[PDB]
Amino acid sequence: AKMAFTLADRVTEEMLADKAALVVEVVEENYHDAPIVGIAVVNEHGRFFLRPETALADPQFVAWLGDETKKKSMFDSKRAAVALKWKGIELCGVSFDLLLAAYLLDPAQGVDDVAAAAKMKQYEAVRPDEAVYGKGAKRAVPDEPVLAEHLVRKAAAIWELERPFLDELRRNEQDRLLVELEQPLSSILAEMEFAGVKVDTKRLEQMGKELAEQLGTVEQRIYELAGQEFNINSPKQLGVILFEKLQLPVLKKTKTGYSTSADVLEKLAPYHEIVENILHYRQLGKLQSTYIEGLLKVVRPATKKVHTIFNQALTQTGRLSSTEPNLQNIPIRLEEGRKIRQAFVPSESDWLIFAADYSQIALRVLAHIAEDDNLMEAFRRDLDIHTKTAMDIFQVSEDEVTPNMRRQAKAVNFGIVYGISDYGLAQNLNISRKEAAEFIERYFESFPGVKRYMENIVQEAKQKGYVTTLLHRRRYLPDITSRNFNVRSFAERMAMNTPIQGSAADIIKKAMIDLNARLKEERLQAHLLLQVHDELILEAPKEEMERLCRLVPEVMEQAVTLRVPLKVDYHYGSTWYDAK
DNA sequence: CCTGACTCC
DNA sequence: TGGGAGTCAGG
Prior knowledge:
Nucleotidyltransferase, domain 5, Taq DNA Polymerase, Chain T, domain 4, Alpha-Beta Plaits, 22 helices, 51% helix, 13% strand, DNA-binding, transferase/dna
């Protein structure tokens, strides 16, 4: 553990070589407008630490950072790029990102620092970030000599690990997935995060004030029905009211006590009117806590924008996640919640929000991968796929499919994608479990290609130890041969689902790259704001809507070619709510 | 820090 | 006994 480096007082020419490992260290977990605490550069000429005050005000270093022909290898380049944007500096030329490389090789390792990636290649000459900075309230930037050594060791690690990681990605046929998909996407995500989304705070606050009144009213109605005050947001207390005081039946337990999940409570609605009120209260309360108060807490006051962070190296299937705030779970299903979307507005006057979503992409991907003739033909003629499944299960003509039938069929269609059991299906639909079991049997009789896919993908996972997606993403399933039924069954359902969910993730990621390319080449002001798994949200001048109406669905539908068409719906309006 | 609730795909 | 996520208040 001995590594020479230079603690530089000024930028020199030899630090500005055309290939380098670069560390631009941002310790705060939310890197938006966060301090850069230090810089390290490792290249052919040596190893260098620079203070940000020095490096970031030096016009040659700033020029080097922005020169796309000066190639940098980094870990979590999006963090660095966004933090630099907040400092008014452009980062270009990032040719290798070790975080994204590690994520593709095995998402289950949970790699979130250089040391963790380094462990995948038995490289030990660098410490974990948590050991250097500490945890929680103890977290602190260490004295310069200690900080400098750490950043330089991180850079040296990236320098030495690039080739071993690329070589393994190449053997896995994942190098193009890194270089042509994830790395270009990282730049697009950086742009989206830094742009942010504008919030109508006057409207949100008015909503909040009216919501608080309604919440108080339901709260009092609940105490009156219970005949007593209690904390409705406490599982223990509520459980005592429902199952001991009011003596309602106990339908389900958790390891800590009585379940009061919405699924459970809905089944108790007929017994006592306190239960519907409790469900309503908890709905309103989550709107208040999360989508009014929580959201206002993260609005940047001077610009009224929120700036999410899209975690690109977290989910086990290749999806993104969205944090602080999560803009991928804004309410839409109930009108009361959906109104929250009225607060999300374009960032300029006379601009509009444009929202485009894939129609049933998971089931279309299933049709493709399973090569199920019945499912394929249905999508080829754009027959509503819930109606189709109802026809086959109930053995009725399309005209005989009743609203309840299509509802049962829709539950089956998605259930299948998750490996649902007859129990889960019966619980979800509130039908006899015998009936549910018959639905699943009939489904697999009607879609034999899907049945074979479910059988075969489990066999593949057991033989290989992992499953793949269309663009060669992997998920390892080391528990798939467990002798324990619960453990094994969960892994089997992951095997069934991951190629579907993950291939859908691959597709929309490629679509984002293709769409950005078309937007930039056409010099449109339109730009991406958000991705929500199977949908993309943009804003643009109202004059550009006619163009987007053609461009956005076409690019999304053509991103990949499957054995069935892809179909995209789209809407636009003056707020996100109105983009429907 | 975990649990269980609500929110989305 | 339904796949993937994040935030919240209370435990």
